[PDB]
């Protein structure tokens, strides 16, 4: 789209400085091995819905 950004550099506040390095504890590690995986052959309706979703976006 429109590629003309009217910007000036300003000082970074401490709150944004801390937000830009925010961390979250590692979640659900080892879960793929606990649950296991298998190839799925879902509903024809689900296949069509996947196609319609990926084509609309």
């Amino acid at each position: 789209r429109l590629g003309e950004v009217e910007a000036r550099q300003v000082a970074t506040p401490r709150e944004a400085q801390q937000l830009a390095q925010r961390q979250e504890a590692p979640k659900g590690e080892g879960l793929l091995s606990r649950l296991g995986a298998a190839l799925a052959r879902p509903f024809v309706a689900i296949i069509e819905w996947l196609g319609k979703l990926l084509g609309s976006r």
Binding site: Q21, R22, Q23, E24, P26, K27, G28, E29, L31, L32, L35, G36, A37, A38, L39, A40, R41, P42, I46, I47, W49, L50, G51, K52, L53, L54, S56, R57
Partner: protein, 116 residues
């Protein structure tokens, strides 16, 4: 079929101990426990994974949609057409190895498990 996406899917199915599927309208679906996840190339040179939820509860401006140090942290959006809630993550293909694809799918499934 983009060879990058082909190799990425092959590495993922190797990391999951599964036979690698063929190039055949490759929008793949995996059953990870009770979670039906979907893999696709969207956009080009980008591996996208996502799973549909059933809830309509606390899906707007959640802590899930806040960035973390993990780029594979899934985002929870909603399809305006079907109304479905979708938890998704995405990674560029040209920088992927087996560990990162496994990590992407694992974070997707973890967030899907912790959202009921």
């Amino acid at each position: 079929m983009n060879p990058l996406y082909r190799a990425a899917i092959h590495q993922l199915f190797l990391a999951l101990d599964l036979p690698t599927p063929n190039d055949e309208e490759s929008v793949l679906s995996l059953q990870v426990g009770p979670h039906l996840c979907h893999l696709a190339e969207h956009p080009t040179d980008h591996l996208l994974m996502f799973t549909r939820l059933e809830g309509q509860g606390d899906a707007t401006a959640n802590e899930q949609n806040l960035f973390s140090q993990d780029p594979c942290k899934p985002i929870l959006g909603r399809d305006p057409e079907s109304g479905e809630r979708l938890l998704w993550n995405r990674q560029p293909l040209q920088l992927l190895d087996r560990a990162q694809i496994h990590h992407q799918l694992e974070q997707l499934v973890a967030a899907a498990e912790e959202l009921r």
